[PDB]
Design a protein around this ligand. Structure first.
Ligand code: NAD
Length: 332
């Protein structure tokens, strides 16, 4: 007999078991692995599944995480090119595909990554028909639209990581200038996770003190403090980090784990993530971009109607138009 047989006396009959809060990460690159480590570090899942086309890399990553199992609270970690390993996921994070080279627009990746997604998305829904999908691959807003169309899932189950990262960066820069913790500075970057994102100056506050009320020129070119530059630093951050280290991953890995925590803990916390915004702020096409949304175990259940300033509406409209310009020309 096995020493297993000698040591372990069953009390319950053998049974094949179904994970409670399984997460799949598709793509084990810089971003995929950073999401994986953040998810594991927060004990957010009882079963982590990884998928990539690079079989050796994939196995290598799986084994490295497994070797750290002692320090974790995730009893099953599996990896394969074959989507069968992904069955019964609560949440599937897609980080797979091409990324920006230095100075390259996220929008320039669309054609290559649409082809990647045309293969990936149907496999995901095949093995996890009841899942939530979080799209991370760029351009994140467009690929969220693409995923929604390809998957046939309702709007509340298809979410782009969107501006959760931009707002994090914004709140960090704000906190830098004020000497407080980013969590105590409040402000929203909305619209495209990209060059046309929108700083919602009207909602920026510390302890409910409206900063645009203290400084009505906030966000203009007529600004004593220089807030427009903060937004510009938010816009430029990815390019700057890509120029320095080649890609970004840590902040996004943390942003993604933040979103997953809200969903799997059923918290209904509000995050700026990418959703279908048709009919809001006079946006008349099926555009996906970020607005503040309520996230819980069902996914993205609500959007917050804001009282945006006229200029902010115009900026958000421009973002929708930029994104629609690309969306409209897509096939299948
Ligand atoms: N949304 C955000 O805020 C944000 C932030 C950073 C990066 N990104 C995007 O995340 C994506 C990943 O970036 P990265 O640095 O991890 O790239 P990377 O090259 O390190 O990793 C990409 C991984 O995707 C895998 N892959 C390619 N085609 C695949 C397919 N058909 N099926 C399964 N896997 C496939 C590749 O083999 C590779 O391992 C890029 O699109 C990048 O622009 C988004």
């Amino acid at each position: 007999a096995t020493l297993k047989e000698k040591l372990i006396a069953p009390v319950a009959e053998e049974e094949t078991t179904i994970p409670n809060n399984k997460i799949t990460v598709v793509g084990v690159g810089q971003v995929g692995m950073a999401c994986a480590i953040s998810i594991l570090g927060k004990s957010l899942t009882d079963e982590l599944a990884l998928v990539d086309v690079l079989e050796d890399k994939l196995k290598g990553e799986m084994m490295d995480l497994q070797h750290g199992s002692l320090f974790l609270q995730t009893p099953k970690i599996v990896a394969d090119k074959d989507y069968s390993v992904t069955a019964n996921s609560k949440i599937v994070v897609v980080t797979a595909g091409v990324r920006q080279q230095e100075g390259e627009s996220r929008l320039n990746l669309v054609q290559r990554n649409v082809n990647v997604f045309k293969f990936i998305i149907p496999q995901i829904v095949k093995y996890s028909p009841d899942c939530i999908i979080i799209v991370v691959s760029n351009p994140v807003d467009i690929l969220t639209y693409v995923t929604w169309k390809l998957s046939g899932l309702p709007k509340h189950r298809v979410i782009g990581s969107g501006c959760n990262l931009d707002s994090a960066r914004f709140r960090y820069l704000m906190a830098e200038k004020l000497g407080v913790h980013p969590s105590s500075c409040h402000g929203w970057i909305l619209g495209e996770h990209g060059d046309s994102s929108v700083a919602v100056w009207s909602g920026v506050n510390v302890a409910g003190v409206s900063l645009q009320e203290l400084n009505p020129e906030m966000g203009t070119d007529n600004d004593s403090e220089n807030w427009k530059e903060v937004h510009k630093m938010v816009v430029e951050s990815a390019y700057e980090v890509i120029k320095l280290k080649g890609y970004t991953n840590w902040a996004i890995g943390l942003s993604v784990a933040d979103l997953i925590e809200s969903m799997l803990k059923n918290l209904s916390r509000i995050h700026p993530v990418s959703t279908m915004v048709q009919g809001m702020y006079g946006i008349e096409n099926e555009v996906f971009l970020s607005l503040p949304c309520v996230l819980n175990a069902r996914g993205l259940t609500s959007v917050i109607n804001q009282k945006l300033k006229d200029d902010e509406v115009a900026q958000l409209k421009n973002s929708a138009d930029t994104l629609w310009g690309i969306q409209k020309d897509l096939k299948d």
